[PDB]
Amino acid sequence: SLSFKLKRNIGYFILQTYMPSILITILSWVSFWINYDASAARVALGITTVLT
Amino acid sequence: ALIEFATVNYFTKSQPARAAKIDRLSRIAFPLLFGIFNLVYWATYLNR
Numbered sequence A: 001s002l003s004f005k006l007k008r009n010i011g012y013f014i015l016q017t018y019m020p021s022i023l024i025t026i027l028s029w030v031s032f033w034i035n036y037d038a039s040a041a042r043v044a045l046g047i048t049t050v051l052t
Numbered sequence B: 001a002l003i004e005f006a007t008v009n010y011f012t013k014s015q016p017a018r019a020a021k022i023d024r025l026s027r028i029a030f031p032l033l034f035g036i037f038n039l040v041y042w043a044t045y046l047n048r
C-alpha cells in the first residue's frame, strides 16, 4: 500500500463562498438603519439577501 | 455606495445639511476613485 494524506487548501473557498455570504449578511444588517416607516426598502433588502 | 445611502438616510430628517454635503461629496469622490483605480490597475497589469 502506498498511502497519501492530502490537505485541502481553503483559500479558494474563502474567496468564492465564504466571503460572498459574509458580505451578504453584512448587507442584510443595513436593513436596521433604515427608518421603520419604509416598507418596501427593508423588504427589498431582506428578499434580495435571502435570494443571494 | 450602499453604506453611503444608509448613512444619508440615517442623517436625513435630522441633519439635512450633513446629508446633502456627504451626498455632494460622494458624487465626485466615487467616480474619481474608480477612474484612478482603473488607471493603476491597467497600468500595472499591462506593463508586465
Ligand SMILES: *[C@@H]1O[C@H](CO)[C@@H](O[C@@H]2O[C@H](CO)[C@@H](O[C@@H]3O[C@H](CO)[C@@H](O)[C@H](O)[C@@H]3O)[C@H](O)[C@H]2NC(C)=O)[C@H](O)[C@H]1NC(C)=O
Pocket (backbone or CB within 6 Å): A003, A004, A005
Ligand atoms: C491513511 O490510511 C491508512 C489506512 O487507513 C493508514 O495506514 C495505517 O497505518 C497504521 C500505522 O502505520 C497501521 O498500523 C500498523 O499496524 C501494524 C501491525 O503489525 C504495525 O506493525 C505497524 O507498526 C502499525 O502500527 C495500519 O495497519 C495501516 N492501515 C492498514 C489498513 O494497514 C495510514 O497511516 C493513513 N495515513 C497516511 C498518511 O497514509
